Write a protein that binds this ligand. Sequence first.
Ligand code: MG
Lengths: 189, 186
Amino acid sequence: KKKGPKYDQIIDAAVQVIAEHGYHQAQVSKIAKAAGVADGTIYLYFNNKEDVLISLFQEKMGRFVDKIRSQMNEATDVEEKLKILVNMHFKQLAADHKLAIVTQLELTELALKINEVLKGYLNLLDELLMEGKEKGYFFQELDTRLARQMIFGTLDEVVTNWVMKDCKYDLTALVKPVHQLLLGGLRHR
Amino acid sequence: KYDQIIDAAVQVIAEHGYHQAQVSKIAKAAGVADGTIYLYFNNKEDVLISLFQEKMGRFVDKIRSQMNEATDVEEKLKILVNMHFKQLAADHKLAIVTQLELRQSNTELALKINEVLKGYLNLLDELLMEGKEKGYFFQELDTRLARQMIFGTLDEVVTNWVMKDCKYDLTALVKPVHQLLLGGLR
Ligand SMILES: [Mg+2]
């Protein structure tokens, strides 16, 4: 279903208030003022703060994935697809520091829901891994589930450390060695 | 009664969550007066930190002693993966604490937890430097990135197991996790 115009507006403002103040100390009224709307307008779109948070994540992630998926199918080799995934992951977060703060630090039943949204990205990883196995790029005895956990767990840990250091350094400088490290492990490159 | 308070803290935090976990709840579960809790800890945060610090310290110490007995750097890595999974597989409530409850939004609590975690990350750093110097790992290996890969991967595997109600055997994953980290995807 297509969004109301203010929908996108509240979410954007939600990112800013949550990052700047923290999730617990964020309030619907402060999100309203930041989005430039009346408090009651927010409740037309969302029921409460946690509904804003999950809609935020669902929305941001849905586009995050489709953009990665797009950059991927206009490519040849599957290791360049992996490179594309790794660079699209870092770039999108590098392009939005406040969003990175929300997804890495400010993100119970809540956790379960966040995990469900994440499944879309994990599915994309699975597709990539299945393809690479099938075409003999990745070794064939590779467990797709474990490989997905290694890839996601590594990218997420790199990003989270960057957010902990106040997004100070160039995250996209890590694209190539992360990519290489995923492909060759500790032993090879 | 220090160890009893620690064990009780795990139980309570795992059952109720760090937020609704009250110190008087911990005292009861440990079988001591509320007052005795404050001979060791001065608040609920200090209980959580000292809990992590006590578990982690023990964990890291036992890994170090088992490694210093190993003959092989890849064996040392396997020992670390094995101990990481074995300790949590033996104590699901401790897993709930390390995987879910130690995960803070709060800046300053998260900061002090991370400080404790650094004892483990430093151990991974040492092992990685050793492996490079002895030629197990390639000489241009980025130590910090490799540390984040190993830790990020282990933590993700444990979290997915915790999220699936610990229903499969986490220790069965030691060997394939070990092989994957050493050889990568290709
Ligand atoms: Mg992680």
